[PDB]
Amino acid sequence: SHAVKIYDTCIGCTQCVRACPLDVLEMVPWDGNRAGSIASSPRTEDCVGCKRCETACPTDFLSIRVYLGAETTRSMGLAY
Amino acid sequence: QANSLPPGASSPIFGGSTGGLLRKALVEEKYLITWGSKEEQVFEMPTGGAATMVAGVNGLYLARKEQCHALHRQLVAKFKIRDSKIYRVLPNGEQTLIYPKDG
Amino acid sequence: PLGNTIPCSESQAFKDLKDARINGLKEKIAATDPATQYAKDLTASMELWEYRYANYEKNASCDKDSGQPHLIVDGRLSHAGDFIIPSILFLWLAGALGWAGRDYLLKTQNAMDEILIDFSKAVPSLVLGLAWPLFAIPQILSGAIRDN
Amino acid sequence: IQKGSQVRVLRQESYWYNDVGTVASVDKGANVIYPVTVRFEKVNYSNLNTNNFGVSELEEV
Amino acid sequence: TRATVDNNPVPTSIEKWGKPGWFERSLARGPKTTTWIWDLHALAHDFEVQTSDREDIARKIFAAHFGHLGIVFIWASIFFFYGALSSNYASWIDNPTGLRPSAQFAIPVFGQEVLNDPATAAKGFEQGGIVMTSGLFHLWRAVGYTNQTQLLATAVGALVAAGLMFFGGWFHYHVRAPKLEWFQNVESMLNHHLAGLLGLGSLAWTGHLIHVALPVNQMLDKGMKAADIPLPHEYAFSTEAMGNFFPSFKQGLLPFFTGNWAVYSDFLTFKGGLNPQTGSLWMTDIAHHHLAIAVMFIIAGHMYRTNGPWNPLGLGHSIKEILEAHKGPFTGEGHKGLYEVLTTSWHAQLAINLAMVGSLSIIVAHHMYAMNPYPYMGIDYPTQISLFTHHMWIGGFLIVGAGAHAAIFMVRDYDPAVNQNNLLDRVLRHRDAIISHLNWVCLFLGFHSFGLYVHNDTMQALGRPGDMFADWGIQLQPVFAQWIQSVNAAAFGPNSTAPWVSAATSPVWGGNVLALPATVAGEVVQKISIAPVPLGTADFMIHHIHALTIHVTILILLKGVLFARSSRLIPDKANLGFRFPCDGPGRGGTCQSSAWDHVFLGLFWMYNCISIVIFHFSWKMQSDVYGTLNATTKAVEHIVPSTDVLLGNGTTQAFTQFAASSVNINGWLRDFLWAQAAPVINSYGGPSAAYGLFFLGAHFVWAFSLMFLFSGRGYWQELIESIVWAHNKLKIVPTIQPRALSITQGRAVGVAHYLLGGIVTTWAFFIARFLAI
Amino acid sequence: KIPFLSLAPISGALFIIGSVVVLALANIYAKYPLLHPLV
Numbered sequence A: 001s002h003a004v005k006i007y008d009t010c011i012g013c014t015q016c017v018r019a020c021p022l023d024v025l026e027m028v029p030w031d032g033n034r035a036g037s038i039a040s041s042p043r044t045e046d047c048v049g050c051k052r053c054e055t056a057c058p059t060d061f062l063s064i065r066v067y068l069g070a071e072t073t074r075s076m077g078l079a080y
Numbered sequence B: 001q002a003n004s005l006p007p008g009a010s011s012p013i014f015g016g017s018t019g020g021l022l023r024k025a026l027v028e029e030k031y032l033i034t035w036g037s038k039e040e041q042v043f044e045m046p047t048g049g050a051a052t053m054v055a056g057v058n059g060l061y062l063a064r065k066e067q068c069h070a071l072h073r074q075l076v077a078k079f080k081i082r083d084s085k086i087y088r089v090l091p092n093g094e095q096t097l098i099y100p101k102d103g
Numbered sequence C: 001p002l003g004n005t006i007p008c009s010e011s012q013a014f015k016d017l018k019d020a021r022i023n024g025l026k027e028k029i030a031a032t033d034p035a036t037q038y039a040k041d042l043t044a045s046m047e048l049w050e051y052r053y054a055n056y057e058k059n060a061s062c063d064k065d066s067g068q069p070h071l072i073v074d075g076r077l078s079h080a081g082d083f084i085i086p087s088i089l090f091l092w093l094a095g096a097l098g099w100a101g102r103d104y105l106l107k108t109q110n111a112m113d114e115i116l117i118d119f120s121k122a123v124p125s126l127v128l129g130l131a132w133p134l135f136a137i138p139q140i141l142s143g144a145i146r147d148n
Numbered sequence D: 001i002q003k004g005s006q007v008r009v010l011r012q013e014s015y016w017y018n019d020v021g022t023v024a025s026v027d028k029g030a031n032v033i034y035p036v037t038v039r040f041e042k043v044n045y046s047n048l049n050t051n052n053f054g055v056s057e058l059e060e061v
Numbered sequence E: 001t002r003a004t005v006d007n008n009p010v011p012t013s014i015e016k017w018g019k020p021g022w023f024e025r026s027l028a029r030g031p032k033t034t035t036w037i038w039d040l041h042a043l044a045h046d047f048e049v050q051t052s053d054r055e056d057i058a059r060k061i062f063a064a065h066f067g068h069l070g071i072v073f074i075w076a077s078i079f080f081f082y083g084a085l086s087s088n089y090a091s092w093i094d095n096p097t098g099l100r101p102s103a104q105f106a107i108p109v110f111g112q113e114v115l116n117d118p119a120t121a122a123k124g125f126e127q128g129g130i131v132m133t134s135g136l137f138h139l140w141r142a143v144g145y146t147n148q149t150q151l152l153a154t155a156v157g158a159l160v161a162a163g164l165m166f167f168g169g170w171f172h173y174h175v176r177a178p179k180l181e182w183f184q185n186v187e188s189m190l191n192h193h194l195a196g197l198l199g200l201g202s203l204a205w206t207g208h209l210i211h212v213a214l215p216v217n218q219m220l221d222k223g224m225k226a227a228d229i230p231l232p233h234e235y236a237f238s239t240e241a242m243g244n245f246f247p248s249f250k251q252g253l254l255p256f257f258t259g260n261w262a263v264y265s266d267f268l269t270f271k272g273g274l275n276p277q278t279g280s281l282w283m284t285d286i287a288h289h290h291l292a293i294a295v296m297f298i299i300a301g302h303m304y305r306t307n308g309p310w311n312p313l314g315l316g317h318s319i320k321e322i323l324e325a326h327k328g329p330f331t332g333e334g335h336k337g338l339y340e341v342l343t344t345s346w347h348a349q350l351a352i353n354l355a356m357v358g359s360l361s362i363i364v365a366h367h368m369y370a371m372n373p374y375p376y377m378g379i380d381y382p383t384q385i386s387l388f389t390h391h392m393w394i395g396g397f398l399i400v401g402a403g404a405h406a407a408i409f410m411v412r413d414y415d416p417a418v419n420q421n422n423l424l425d426r427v428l429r430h431r432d433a434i435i436s437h438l439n440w441v442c443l444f445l446g447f448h449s450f451g452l453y454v455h456n457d458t459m460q461a462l463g464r465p466g467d468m469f470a471d472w473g474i475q476l477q478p479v480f481a482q483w484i485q486s487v488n489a490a491a492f493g494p495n496s497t498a499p500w501v502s503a504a505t506s507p508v509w510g511g512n513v514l515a516l517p518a519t520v521a522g523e524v525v526q527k528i529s530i531a532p533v534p535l536g537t538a539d540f541m542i543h544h545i546h547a548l549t550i551h552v553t554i555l556i557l558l559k560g561v562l563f564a565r566s567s568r569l570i571p572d573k574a575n576l577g578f579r580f581p582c583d584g585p586g587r588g589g590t591c592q593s594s595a596w597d598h599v600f601l602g603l604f605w606m607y608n609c610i611s612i613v614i615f616h617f618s619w620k621m622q623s624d625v626y627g628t629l630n631a632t633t634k635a636v637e638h639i640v641p642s643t644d645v646l647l648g649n650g651t652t653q654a655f656t657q658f659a660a661s662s663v664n665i666n667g668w669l670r671d672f673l674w675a676q677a678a679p680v681i682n683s684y685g686g687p688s689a690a691y692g693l694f695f696l697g698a699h700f701v702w703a704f705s706l707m708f709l710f711s712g713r714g715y716w717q718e719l720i721e722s723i724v725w726a727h728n729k730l731k732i733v734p735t736i737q738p739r740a741l742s743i744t745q746g747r748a749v750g751v752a753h754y755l756l757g758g759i760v761t762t763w764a765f766f767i768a769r770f771l772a773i
Numbered sequence F: 001k002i003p004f005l006s007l008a009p010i011s012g013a014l015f016i017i018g019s020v021v022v023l024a025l026a027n028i029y030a031k032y033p034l035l036h037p038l039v
């Protein structure tokens, strides 16, 4: 499976959950921003690695990083 | 038979395509999207072609969860339907909810 | 007479291809009508070729064996027209264009002005590019900018 | 560091490391790690120019 | 009907000339990066991302069409000005066989006057010139051009017509412009393009042929000079001048109104193939041709129903009723929806039309070498190679564009609400079956043509010539194609299928070698224009290569069309668009998954296809058709000689060079590509040295593409980061930020330079070979 | 700024064509040199 990490630079813009084609991410309550929420990935077994979350993240360098790891049926995106 | 719907959900009218389920849906896993529509209307399949769904509860078996979540964003962006719930069906018949996991 | 190099005044093969070109031009004028614009062009080409072969004769172009002119670029003042005069001419015109473009970026700092060239800030930049060392060398001795 | 001040980014992984930016708004809460919003004249590869940095990552020029 | 037109939508102003990128939102904000610059060019004709109003979209399309017809009239005027001013056409009209046609000379500056060719030097043009390969001079001689002042008049008229199409574009955009339901009356546009555009066009050309072009060609073939009569052989007052040339029936047009059509059979004939005097089609057959297809096109424009103020008029068909009558049990609901698709989607219409005009340019390329249309053109071999090659390349380009806009329709204009159970929807329900069976037949064609070539390379290398797939070894004869040779040659005589044809369809089917007088310095008759073209084992093999390349280009473009919207990989591909680079490195990698990338890959595969087509053409025509009649006893000698193939026993057998050397790739390398490239590399210091310069520069552009093709932009961007550091160290700061090209643009730049370099390489090779011998 | 000629391809292309014509007439006026003559 692929490894998704969220750092402390997040602003809670809600653009990585919407642009994710798999619902890997969800917003949990946080205190480190003004939005009161931080992204999290407890669903990394379902991630394909498509990096649409990293495309739509508006910071300088990205608060979300997905690392390409071990490949499964689900993460190679196979319908067979 | 091997792709039986849950009770309460009716099948949409689709004429069958070649882009649908493969042997993985028999042996490893398949997926099921279940939504509620207020009328009968025409939606593009995520595996090619077009289908007509009826008023009430409609369920569709797909090979892949991104096929289901692409169908779900099509229903939101076209038909304003947001009560799609996505199940992972194992080959023994077990069904677990994987969207909305929050509720 | 350098290594695999003799000048034009005692090169046999230069004389051979010079005679070959002037003879080919001689029977190319000699077989045509002198009033059809072909013959006037070929006598203009003959006069041009006589002047260019005499120019290769007089200012010490250098050939050996193949008879064609080999250039010496090590910095001799006898062969100074090989490299040194076009070096200074290149540095003048390239520093003109580079300094004009740099001064244009320094005076505009704008995104419309790069895709729409304002000539009232472009042609004085070109005129001061034509005098670029006098305004470039004190900014070499001063220093530009601190970035890492 | 207040609104209108010119700052230099000290963050090593930034696009705008060693570049002057404009402070547009400073968050008055204390629970935010990076409160200071800085706009730039130059855009990044994502074609955006505004980001929230902290106080210690910025040097007043 | 009724032409509902609105008045003045757009004022005429210079307030958008100073604002480039006005036309969509992200470009309207201004330059920030250099990507904007390339995004200025790639979206400028995409009118659907400019405005969402389909009305205004159709208006921009219409004004674009008028401006295109303007630029084609400008180009027509430019070659008519060059024909009129700086040509040898005043002396080419007297010698079409010994004078090379030229319309352009290099001026004596920088040394380029060696490019002027001595064999174009004549009276009026004493400079030498660039030899043309376009066949413009042979066209002009066939249509009756005897003088350069009428070439001046046509040049002025084409410039006036370019101005008229520009004023039509400005009128039908800015001033008085039609609404969308005018464009959707497809019934009337079919009826007025068949009966009025094609029909009256070829009827007015039949009128030209009869009045001007048949008598001027009869004067030029009976043996007079350039002093002719343009005006006093015309019209009513010299009606008997029509009787002096080829007997104008009894008297006037009174045979036309009383219905005795048999007396008109001396300039409306149905004779047959090619004239042996001039090497081309008989002009009277060409006139009766254009008249019969003129009649049958005005008949074709009487098909579709149009209702209006005319009382009894309004009987016919609607296309929609025909499409909704063709249903079938295998194909569900058939063609219902295709009327709505083809009346609301421009890209589907452009896909159909690009497929048809590309296929038709390919048909034109075949039918113009085989049956020569213009006098003395088939002996001028660089014209023959260049017209076949040119129309084949333009055909392959428009077929790749057909696949492109079919995919673009599938991304943008596809509506599921129109396509319930029609042919278009059911093709999406078995797209895996189509693409996989196409994958299998491409694999089959590639093995069973190119592995035959590999097998021949291997057997000829191992010292086994009798083991070869060749005419001397294991024969693969084109027995259906040879039987169609025998049928289309044998169907001319009495008691045949067509009993009143004199000289058959074409001499390529199997009947007679035709030849023409020509000088060539101080020689004899020589110069075959056309010959029977025999099909052997090498023709089997090259045509199965051709089937392979057509089928793989089909596979790439049709997989782009059918998987434009969704796949098993990316189900939401239609939201990503026609033109996106990937959907990331995940799910294995989605590199080149967009339908644009399939157009990008099918461009190289079209290159492959058309390159092997014109290579087959060059050396088939050189090895079996083109050549010389010897002065001793009428012996046929081709441009490349016959090859004595050494057999396995020790003896030889004479084959032609096509039959002997394209069973394998070594003979394609040696006898076609090494041997015939001798005139493009030895052309320096002479009239073909530009073709050598273009050969080398095109090798350069082809190799320069491979940087863009094999690399990707993240390398280039961190390289430009180092270069931008060097720029900011010396106070040299672009406000427009220097970027690498986008991924899609790196593919586009690479395919553009690959296509340009390879085609201009083959162009330089083809012209420099065929000007020599 | 002036209409249509202030634009960067137009100003750029007229700069390249003007430099090629000035260089060309420099090659005509100097009778096409290879080197700079010293005597």
Ligand code: CLA
Pocket: C097, C098, C099, C100, C101, C102, C104, C117, C121, C122, C123, C125, C126, E722, E723, E726, E727, E730, E732
């Ligand atoms: C104002 C114009 C300008 C100036 C002063 C420079 C200066 C420099 N460049 Mg650069 N460059 C430019 C434009 C310019 N460049 C443009 C337009 C491009 C894109 C084609 C580049 C691409 C480029 C690369 C890849 C590199 C440099 C490098 C360098 C540095 C080393 C010298 C050199 O290699 O020349 C090279 C110059 C070129 C390759 C570009 C050709 C010259 C351009 C066309 C001039 C621009 C004309 C401009 C429009 C004039 C405006 C006039 C105004 C009055 C309107 C040097 C400081 C090198 C470096 O980093 O050295 C350490 C390096 O490798 N440049």
Ligand code: CLA
Pocket: E041, E042, E043, E044, E045, E046, E047, E350, E354, E397, E398, E399, E400, E401, E402, E404, E408, E578, E579, E596, E599, E600, E603, E752, E756
């Ligand atoms: C009737 C013909 C026709 C028409 C009207 C269109 C129209 C369109 N095409 Mg299309 N296409 C066609 C034929 C046609 N095409 C053919 C024959 C091919 C195969 C090559 C394609 C392949 C194609 C692709 C892959 C795409 C389009 C796209 C588009 C759309 C926008 C294009 C644009 O913005 O302009 C911009 C034009 C340029 C930036 C020019 C590019 C550089 C050219 C190719 C180099 C020219 C080299 C020159 C010929 C020779 C060298 C000279 C040089 C040395 C000076 C537009 C709707 C684009 C789109 O997004 O669709 C919605 C899209 O991506 N087309």
Ligand code: CLA
Pocket: E438, E439, E440, E442, E443, E444, E445, E446, E447, E450, E451, E454, E548, E552, E555, E556, E601, E604, E605
């Ligand atoms: C010369 C280089 C080359 C070769 C050999 C191929 C070969 C192939 N391409 Mg490719 N392609 C190329 C360049 C090449 N391509 C380039 C440059 C591009 C970039 C634009 C592409 C892009 C491309 C695309 C997009 C597609 C292909 C497809 C194909 C397959 C076509 C089907 C076929 O021909 O049947 C048969 C195979 C051959 C003719 C290859 C040679 C077979 C030899 C003769 C047999 C060897 C005998 C034996 C096995 C050897 C055993 C030895 C042992 C020690 C192993 C084929 C395998 C298409 C495909 O997959 O369709 C099925 C496909 O869609 N190509």
Ligand code: CLA
Pocket: C101, C102, C104, C105, C113, C114, C115, C117, C119, C122, C123, E034, E035, E037, E720, E723, E724, E727, E732, E733, E734, E738, E739, E740, E741, F008, F009, F011, F012, F014, F015, F017, F018, F019, F022
């Ligand atoms: C990725 C692609 C890319 C693209 C599209 C561009 C595009 C551009 N760059 Mg660039 N650049 C790039 C990458 C790129 N760059 C990279 C990688 C670098 C290295 C870091 C640079 C660094 C760079 C610099 C430093 C500069 C540019 C500039 C420019 C602009 C040039 C404007 C122009 O050519 O007209 C040229 C206009 C003229 C030459 C004006 C003269 C015309 C006269 C006034 C007309 C009268 C003359 C008359 C006709 C007589 C003729 C005779 C003659 C001899 C005088 C242009 C928009 C330049 C700019 O900003 O615009 C000025 C600039 O200075 N770039």
Ligand SMILES: CC1=C(/C=C/C(C)=C/C=C/C(C)=C/C=C/C=C(C)/C=C/C=C(C)/C=C/C2=C(C)CCCC2(C)C)C(C)(C)CCC1
Pocket: E076, E153, E154, E155, E156, E157, E158, E161, E200, E204
């Ligand atoms: C080359 C060219 C050109 C020229 C053109 C021209 C020269 C034109 C034309 C034209 C023409 C000159 C046309 C015409 C026509 C016609 C028509 C369209 C006709 C008709 C008809 C009719 C309709 C008839 C009818 C009838 C019948 C059938 C029956 C009996 C009676 C009658 C006789 C009535 C230019 C330079 C511009 C440009 C480029 C291209």
Ligand SMILES: CC1=C(/C=C/C(C)=C\C=C\C(C)=C\C=C\C=C(C)/C=C/C=C(C)/C=C/C2=C(C)CCCC2(C)C)C(C)(C)CCC1
Pocket: E694, E696, E697, E698, E700, E701, E757, E759, E760, E763
């Ligand atoms: C330094 C410099 C320079 C130089 C450069 C170089 C070194 C180069 C090169 C280059 C090369 C090395 C090459 C090339 C090439 C190209 C080509 C090759 C092209 C083209 C084009 C075109 C235009 C095309 C056309 C055509 C078509 C359209 C198709 C068909 C055929 C033909 C041909 C017709 C210059 C002078 C700028 C100036 C100064 C600076």
Ligand SMILES: CC(C)=CCC/C(C)=C\CC/C(C)=C\CC/C(C)=C/CC1=C(C)C(=O)c2ccccc2C1=O
Pocket: E707, E708, E709, E711, E712, E713, E716, E739, E740, E741, E742, E743, E745, E746, E747, F009, F012, F013
């Ligand atoms: C009047 C006139 C003509 C003016 C010219 C206008 C002026 C002044 C400059 C314009 C700069 C020019 C001419 C080119 C820049 C293009 C560029 C940054 C290429 C680097 C690059 C290479 C080499 C690849 O292989 C590649 C592969 C895959 C993806 C991306 C790339 C990529 O990005």
Ligand code: SF4
Pocket: A004, A019, A020, A021, A022, A023, A024, A025, A046, A047, A048, A049, A050, A051, A052, A053, A054, A066, E586
């Ligand atoms: S890589 Fe793709 S699937 Fe994974 S979290 Fe990011 S957007 Fe979602």
Ligand code: SF4
Pocket: A009, A010, A011, A012, A013, A014, A015, A016, A017, A039, A053, A056, A057, A058, A059, A062, A063, A064
């Ligand atoms: S990780 Fe990026 S996209 Fe997601 S909430 Fe934070 S800033 Fe927004």
